[PDB]
Design a protein around this ligand. Structure first.
Ligand SMILES: [Mg+2]
Ligand SMILES: [Mg+2]
Ligand SMILES: [Mg+2]
Ligand SMILES: [Mg+2]
Ligand SMILES: [Zn+2]
Ligand SMILES: [Zn+2]
Lengths: 400, 398
């Protein structure tokens, strides 16, 4: 059977709840269900191994999801004693099934890394990239050109991989073994791109290849930038990444309607930023304003710094006109640089929209577990994140 | 059948998740499950009627859970056109079933008010109180002596209600119709009390009386002060209220083990304060420190401002010795008053515990739904809060 594990990096309960309200049609009376609402089946604890406290990082959480083992923050498929653990992908391969990963961050980032490689530290990018050549994964799509040298790519070409760097080349890929690196590091923010279908395209392509194996497959799809946006406390950019992730989930749903013998599992590796729908004593979340933001605070700050006359440009991208107080704040910030300007912009956006945050890091709240397919009910209720791995693994073909 | 609807007021996902870690035994390697972990079945959206935006208040959400209808923020069992809605309590009474409410806030606060009365505004405390005289609820336990005049109490007595004001009198109550008002307004914080069993006692007493009705009953239990602590961004006091609510939930589980034909549903009305486990870039939550706090910042402050030698007192109640800079922040806040001192203490608690907050009000994140009993599966997955009402109502006899 086919299997798809989708991870909304840093997508705690607030993110999915926010997405519903953000996408709510202001003209329709009721609030329309989102794909998350339709697929919710349970929740999961995200804590790492005891020695790391109660707040996990992406490496530890991904390790739990791919191996069913807890481990220290930073660990990449190795246990607390740095012993390499068998990932579900290895189990799949050992069973002659196809495997793959499609993400928006570098293909060698923590999450995908924990599914295809083993390393005592997530910081070892080049070694992890090289180790991926041992996984023999059929599909590797995402960013991270910076981490693969001409010589490494050559080794990948020798083992039968087709190397591509432009989305325009996807159409010509119709056979297993593809290494697609579509960006130096992470792919472009959805809010600043031509549309929100890039992750969906990598997903649809993965399914097209993987599904040609009668024995089945295990595909990992990660909405990696939800987390990055969360760290930046960037709500407008976060919601855009949420749409990109939701579109991909839709891609898989359609696939399942056409391939009934499949299991889809969607979850978060952890929560990021402490996002809150409503803030500062305000009992409301102004979604009308966010929808009007057509660019990332970074994009808006870059432009504002490059233009002599920038004020009109900022209001045009924010979707509203800044007042005198906020104008002076953008003015001072601009003199101090791009970074300080972005922060100034996000402060205005957050104050205007009543969006809250508690940290630039992670938080420990349990995340949601979603699923679709015959075995969906195995993931009902509360469970630890490691249990998600054990369940998916229990569906793989018999030992003999 | 027997039915129990337990509401953890303001108890979003962060609270129950925090509670697990807060309760985590430092000695055992594994993190033990909580009663919430064992009972979780789904989640619910909490938004109120469209005219009120996406963020609900307690009155609107309580109305949804009790009637299955959305309404504006502040509404007490009336729709957007201010029309009175039939609550599950009314439906229950109409079926000859017993009803009751047990809470830690005033008995006429938003939530319980939505289950027993009808009013266009939660603020009309006097009318709501008077209106409870018409609900015919067999059990009404909580705080709120402040809202029941001697004449009103007199009227309740004429209807067969036994009036009590001290927990010492519970034992003497063995028959239907009791008005228990155990405080001027809300009951004492769990962290400043003798133990976290007060709500469990009101709960157990409700079950004892209600279960004597062969036709069944519908009981509302609310851990009301979780929300209050959340509003004051008070984590140590919030965790204590969670313990008291978790104990009450345990009382009901025990009950069910002895009364198989029962349904328990636990949920929250909405989230409060934007609480977060970890904060300010720190990837951790210092639970060792919170556990050491033995009193509410409020209590700590009042005592500190009242005392001469207060330095050692604060450290003693915080469980850790404050530092140079923190002492001066406290010394100064202490000069302005109890309130400014409380804020200074909470700032220190949050900073050193890595506990975050985003507001003093509510937030819109969905909340969890827990259930136990034969019909527990009806509450699986995602649902709107109004649907929890519909499902519970569908199990009513007829
Ligand atoms: Mg990653
Ligand atoms: Mg929220
Ligand atoms: Mg209340
Ligand atoms: Mg949290
Ligand atoms: Zn992160
Ligand atoms: Zn509240």
């Amino acid at each position: 059977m086919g299997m798809i594990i989708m991870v909304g990096d840093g997508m705690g309960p607030a993110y999915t709840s926010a997405y519903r309200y953000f996408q709510d049609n202001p003209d329709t009376e009721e609030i329309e269900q989102t794909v998350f609402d339709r697929l919710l089946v349970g929740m999961a604890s995200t804590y790492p191994a005891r020695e790391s406290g109660y707040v996990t990082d992406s490496a530890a959480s991904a390790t739990a999801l791919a191996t069913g083992f807890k481990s220290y923050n930073g660990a990449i498929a190795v246990d607390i004693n740095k012993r390499p653990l068998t990932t579900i992908m290895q189990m799949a391969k050992a069973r002659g099934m196809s495997t793959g990963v499609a993400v928006t961050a570098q293909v060698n980032h923590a999450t995908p890394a924990a599914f295809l490689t083993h390393n005592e530290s997530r910081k070892n990018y080049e070694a992890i990239a090289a180790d991926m050549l041992k996984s023999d994964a059929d599909v590797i799509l995402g960013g991270g050109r910076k981490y693969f040298s001409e010589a490494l790519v050559s080794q990948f070409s020798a083992k039968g991989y087709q190397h591509i760097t432009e989305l325009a080349q996807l159409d010509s890929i119709t056979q297993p073994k593809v290494l697609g690196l579509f960006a130096e590091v992470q792919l472009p923010w959805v809010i600043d791109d031509t549309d929100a279908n890039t992750l969906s395209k990598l997903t649809q392509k993965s399914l097209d290849l993987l599904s040609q194996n009668e024995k089945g497959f295990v595909l990992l799809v990660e909405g990696s930038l939800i987390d990055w946006a969360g760290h930046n406390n960037d709500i407008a950019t976060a919601m855009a990444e949420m749409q990109g992730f939701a579109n991909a989930i839709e891609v898989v749903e359609q696939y399942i309607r056409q391939h009934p013998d499949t299991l889809l599992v969607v979850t978060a590796d952890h929560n990021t930023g402490g996002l809150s729908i409503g803030a500062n004593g305000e009992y409301q979340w102004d979604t009308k304003l966010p929808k009007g933001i057509s660019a990332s605070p970074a994009s808006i700050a870059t432009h504002a710094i490059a233009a002599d006359d920038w004020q009109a440009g900022v209001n045009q991208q924010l979707g509203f006109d800044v007042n005198s107080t906020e104008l002076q704040q953008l003015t001072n910030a601009r003199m101090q640089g791009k970074s300080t300007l972005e922060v100034a912009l996000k402060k205005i956006i957050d104050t205007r929209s009543y969006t809250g945050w508690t940290t630039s890091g992670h938080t420990g709240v349990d995340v949601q577990v979603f699923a679709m397919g015959p075995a969906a009910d195995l993931f009902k209720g509360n469970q630890d994140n490691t249990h998600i791995a054990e369940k998916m693994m229990s569906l793989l073909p018999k030992v003999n």
